């Protein structure tokens with residue numbers, strides 16, 4: 003499988019489309035691994051990784067996403083593509099090591115997801131929660147990333163120096179942990195404060211980490227930034243996963259919270275409106291403030307919000 007990837011060439015008709023924030027990978031499943039190779043090559047250079055190691059790595063990542071309704075291989079590549087578009091539109095700001103780390107972090111950020119929230123795992127004293135008390139799944143995702151990197155023929159970072167290697171692994175660690183949405187709220191609030199007091203300073207590593215964390219959230223949530231038919235379908239996948247978790251609670255006779263209850267289906271449009279207003283709009287607003295070229299994400303998020311309003315109002 004990995005050898006045929008080495009030969010892959012992105013069809014020329016997709017060379018312009020892939021640069022756009024709203025690009026939907028949906029119709030191109032057999033190309034997803036090749037699309038990631040393409041994005042790495044354009045963003046980090048063709049001399050960045052040894053091609054064979056990169057190809058082995060990508061295929062091992064793919065195999066370590068489970069067949070769940072939403073946190074699957076499709077989501078991994080979708081998030082990686084959003085990061086690509088952010089990086090391509092902010093060419094001066096990030097280092098070569100950051101561009102490498104962040105594309106890899108995005109592809110890996112939900113590795114071996116089981117379709118359960120951290121809350122679920124903690125409540126039922128699952129072994130992963132016994133191991134990782136906070137940001138439970140995210141620590142697991144990073145752990146899985148490191149395990150794949152340490153496989154024979156998979157160390158894509160083998161040709162970095164000792165210091166550069168630990169640096170990129172820390173970029174990846176922080177970026178994956180930042181995808182714990184519980185951490186986003188505080189991160190965005192701190193960034194908003196720093197922005198408006200004019201103290202935000204990208205020479206400051208801790209400020210940089212915060213900006214990278216917000217970029218990670220923005221990429222992770224980017225299904226809300228696609229054209230309406232794409233966004234609407236992805237919402238189906240998201241709730242399928244919410245409801246499957248709810249169903250697991252019902253197996254103990256336990257009534258789940260509304261968001262995870264398939265019997266509360268009629269409340270979905272209102273639920274989405276609430277989520278866009280409370281989470282997605284603030285995310286892309288703050289991101290656009292810090293990185294003006296990301297504005298198309300906010301524009302697309304606003305468009306989908308108005309679509310959900312129309313659904314609620316029966317228009």
Ligand SMILES: COc1cn(-c2ccc3c(c2F)C(C)(C)C(=O)N3CC2CC2)nc(-c2ccnn2-c2ccccc2)c1=O
Pocket residue numbers: 119120182183184185222223224225226240261273274277281
């Ligand atoms: C209602 O509709 C939606 C609700 N959520 C949502 C999710 C988790 C949590 C919450 C949410 F709102 C709250 C309630 C804030 C919460 O505490 N968690 C758990 C998390 C803190 C640790 N996400 C999406 C969405 C749109 C795009 N990607 N995702 C997404 C889907 C699954 C997981 C994460 C994000 C969505 O569409």
Ligand SMILES: [Mg+2]
Pocket residue numbers: 111112139181182
């Ligand atoms: Mg996650």
Ligand SMILES: [Zn+2]
Pocket residue numbers: 077081111112181222
């Ligand atoms: Zn994710």
